[PDB]
Design a protein around this ligand. Structure first.
Ligand SMILES: Cc1cccc(NC(=O)[C@@H]2CCCN2)n1
Ligand SMILES: Cc1cccc(NC(=O)[C@@H]2CCCN2)n1
Lengths: 412, 412
């Protein structure tokens, strides 16, 4: 048997806001966080826009001196992590510190830092490389710095499963708690790949929307005019907690994490299969994990990246999995507003899935002006939709054919 | 309920050889794989040597056309993964493909690749960044590419926990099998951090031995004249398999994985606590996990990095966990011969640990001419020591205060 896992704290940086409530206000209002990228020369680039975090003050969290040692993705992960722990009310003690762990991930990690240290290496040679270059750039330092700051002595690790990182991180954090290895985990992901290499690398694979004339319309999942994903920055963190632990301290419980699905496509390095067979197995795995029939699902936060092959595979996957229930559930892509936070996508979208449960409302897919061939599900086009939501799925599909699904259920 | 997990397959690239048996012969013979580096000009660097993989032919595994798109750490991960799977005798079929997954990790991932594209970006511009830059460089694509080549549709992920990555990857893949998420996992890690940013970045931190004039004597764990770790390249992969699944197909069983511990130090970003408190908490978690009396431990493959603080913290941790039995067990660092493969270190060392059980021999700590203050355990100085080993333990510690312990025993 297995312990139950609830969500008692959430934290976020996104293109829509510097916390969860501001981000969620944007989501429900159908606001875009997408805009031309500033303080950065993108003249030679085919994409000049994306979702930046606007107005982030790291000194609300760290001294200027400690922040100078850390890549932006690490700053963003720590901000979401500190927010979620504060949100939870959790008190770390000598009696529980060994039962509280961290799994914050990243898809791509310290590109901005690697870029600036490369600049120095090429211009001036090795002796201008920062002594903090390695510990300030590696993906496990959000978990590491968070554990050192709060005295957390539980399981300390980091996933990196490209665009599936946030989903996998929350899921395997839930397993740690369910199977009794910890009572509390801080889990999610952070990303800041709006550097030359992120825009250039994804630009070189022709992965990115090039709609520079209208950045707020670039991200249009399931729309017949979509031309690739919109690159976005930020972080999500959740405080996961064993239910009896949460009840005993009188925690506020947002929702219960009932199911976790993983699967490999084993198909292609970057492209999903057209029938969405991997996403189908993953969702089926996640619903089995939860002991739920596909009929009980009301809301799916899609991966919904706005790429030609990706959006259409997810329609295929959902129809395969949910048969005659496929039209009854609502499925939206919050990436229509946020863009694609890569390794952080699954984290902020888990929070949006939890808040859909609290507020009984399906977030919109904005820009869904002309649903494509086969895209005839309830994609919640243009505007938020109030409705009954007992069960919410969050899907992530990433490079290497790596899939993740989280099943959240209302707790009352 | 919790299932048992055994090792049916191993594979390796190291500075000592291009597979496991050739690497293991080097270990037992006290051979150093450390030499001045030849693949770049390091005259501007304070460290000009490391454990390179020598004479690696990727066309023993992949087409030159797919290899050209992949960072060496991925090529190294795939070579070790392919060896381990072949060594297991397992056949992937439609009947089991969904129960076979992969967790191959890395500390730093495609730093060589990212540096090369960074160079193209800064001298030429973004139009010269490879279209393959992202899928050819990010850490999860060892798991990704292995799944695509072999048709593995089980859990597909990667850990990144710096120098602990290999141990965590193995430990967590065993938990996946233990809890019935998979019947087989290919797990371990791979690293190729010998580029400008790698040797420069660790150099900037003053973490590396600067013994350029005698590279084979540089790695001298617990020796009073140790001056930092030696950077080494390679991969380790194991086939982990549910015991009954292995029995049902008549698999050759190297050993049983009975114990896994993780703890965070919550002490410092890069320095271990002098008293080994985090490593002690970690070994105890793992011995408890294995249902063991600590006196059952015969052999420890120490992290043993040849840093001043790390080496002494490990003695302290072993004395505190094993009390007077700390004087009866044998503990050695194969990093004396391989150097430090960072995220692959836990993977090759798990294999050395399993071969110490197969062959009933404790590998030496070479270069241990003058053991330091308090370093008075059986550290198997100079020469392999034949001896009874029923139970072997492999330790890793990492930046972020992240700890891993694996416990193996002989199986009948
Ligand atoms: C591809 C593209 C470019 C510019 C605008 C739009 N969509 C609209 O303007 C929507 C549809 C009709 C009412 N408003 N789509
Ligand atoms: C793409 C690439 C690879 C290796 C080196 C360089 N550039 C140089 O070596 C410098 C630039 C100014 C004069 N030569 N670029």
């Amino acid at each position: 048997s297995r312990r139950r896992v609830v969500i008692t704290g959430m934290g976020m940086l996104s293109p829509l806001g510097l916390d969860v409530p501001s981000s969620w206000e944007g989501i429900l209002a159908g606001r875009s966080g997408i805009a031309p990228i500033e303080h950065m020369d993108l003249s030679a680039y085919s994409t000049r826009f994306g979702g930046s975090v606007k107005g982030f003050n790291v000194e609300e969290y760290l001294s200027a001196k400690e922040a100078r040692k850390l890549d932006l993705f690490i700053q963003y992960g720590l901000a979401a992590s500190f927010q979620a722990v504060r949100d939870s009310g959790l008190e770390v003690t000598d009696a529980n510190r060994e039962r509280i762990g961290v799994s914050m991930g990243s898809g791509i990690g310290g590109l901005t830092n690697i870029e600036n240290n490369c600049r120095s290496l090429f211009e001036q040679g090795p002796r201008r490389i920062s002594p903090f270059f390695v510990p300030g750039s590696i993906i496990n330092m959000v978990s590491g710095f968070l554990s050192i700051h709060l005295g957390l002595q539980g399981p300390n690790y980091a996933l990196t499963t490209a665009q599936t990182t946030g989903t996998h991180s929350i899921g395997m954090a839930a397993r740690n708690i369910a199977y009794g290895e910890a009572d509390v985990m801080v889990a999610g992901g952070s990303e800041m790949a709006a550097c030359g290499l992120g825009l250039g690398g994804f630009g070189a694979a022709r992965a990115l929307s090039t709609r520079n004339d209208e950045p707020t319309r670039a991200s249009r999942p399931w729309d017949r005019d979509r031309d690739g994903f919109v690159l976005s920055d930020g972080s999500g963190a959740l405080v996961l907690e064993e239910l009896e632990h949460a009840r005993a301290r009188g925690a506020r419980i947002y929702a219960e994490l009932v199911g976790f699905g993983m699967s490999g496509d084993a198909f292609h390095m970057t492209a999903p299969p057209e029938d969405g067979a991997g996403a189908a197995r993953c969702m089926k795995n996640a619903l089995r994990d939860a002991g739920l029939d596909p009929r009980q699902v009301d809301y799916i936060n899609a991966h919904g990246t706005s790429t030609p092959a990706g959006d259409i595979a997810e329609i295929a996957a959902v129809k395969s999995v949910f048969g005659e229930h496929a039209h009854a559930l609502s499925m939206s892509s919050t990436k229509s507003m946020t863009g694609h936070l890569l390794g952080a996508a699954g984290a902020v979208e888990a929070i949006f899935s939890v808040l859909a449960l609290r507020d009984q409302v399906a977030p919109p897919t904005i820009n869904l002006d002309n649903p494509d061939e086969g895209c005839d599900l309830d994609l919640v086009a243009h505007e938020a939709k109030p409705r009954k939501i007992d069960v919410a799925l969050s899907n992530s599909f990433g490079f290497g054919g790596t899939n993740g699904t989280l099943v959240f259920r209302r707790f009352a």
